[PDB]
């Protein structure tokens, strides 16, 4: 099975197209770098999954999607998802958010903004070990963003003060575990170069 085919059979078309658009923004070709396309797809999916799990009411109280059902009109998502927007627009969303909350605009483009903590978030996904990648991304980012790191081997690196709960962590990690297993069944795994 081609990685191209793996991608088609394992991700939503919406995810795939955004991933291709990102590679277009980066002038890279999906056909020539399927590992990169896969990586972008997984990253996108993680960001959306994280952002659909928490809501905040007007008073700042935190709800899960289930707990909040019937009240959603009166809730707003806890995280703004910046990843997956066209990049040119994303930069301006980031700036707008920073300005609205009286905080510094980060130098680099974030993946999420946490309305509760008023922090930008960078999400990382590794085939290696989460803490190693945390330290690497720290060199670039400093304290400019919260890092949320997940790995395909149930490893992760999250702030003690992250808004993501056990259930949400579990949901991200299970999907990654599931992808690793599916990749392996097609012998696409030990081929893979990940985000690290």
């Amino acid at each position: 099975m081609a990685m191209d085919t793996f991608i088609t059979r394992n991700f939503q078309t919406t995810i795939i197209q955004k991933a291709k658009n990102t590679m277009a923004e980066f002038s890279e070709d999906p056909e020539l770098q399927p590992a990169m396309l896969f990586n972008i797809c997984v990253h996108l999916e993680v960001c959306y999954v994280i952002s659909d799990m928490n809501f905040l009411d007007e008073e700042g109280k935190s709800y899960t999607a289930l707990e909040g059902q019937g009240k959603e009109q009166n809730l707003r998502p806890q995280y703004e998802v910046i990843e997956g927007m066209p990049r040119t627009i994303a930069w301006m969303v980031q700036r707008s958010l920073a300005q609205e909350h009286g905080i510094e605009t980060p130098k680099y483009l974030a993946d999420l903004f946490d309305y509760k903590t008023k922090r930008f978030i960078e999400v990382g996904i590794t085939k290696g070990l989460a803490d190693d990648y945390f330290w690497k991304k720290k060199e670039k980012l400093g304290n400019s963003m919260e890092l949320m790191i997940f790995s395909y081997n149930q490893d992760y690196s999250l702030s003690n003060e992250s808004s993501l709960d056990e259930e949400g962590k579990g949901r991200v990690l299970s999907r990654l575990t599931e992808l690793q297993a599916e990749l392996s069944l097609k012998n696409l795994w030990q081929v893979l170069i990940g985000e690290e």
């Binding site: 939503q12 919406t14 999916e45 659909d52 969303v93």
Partner: peptide, 19 residues
């Protein structure tokens, strides 16, 4: 999982157009 994506894409459009 698809709902997470569908909803996320809606929210992004909502945000951008409110700016």
């Amino acid at each position: 999982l698809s709902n997470d994506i569908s909803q996320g894409i809606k929210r992004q459009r909502m945000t951008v157009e409110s700016m």
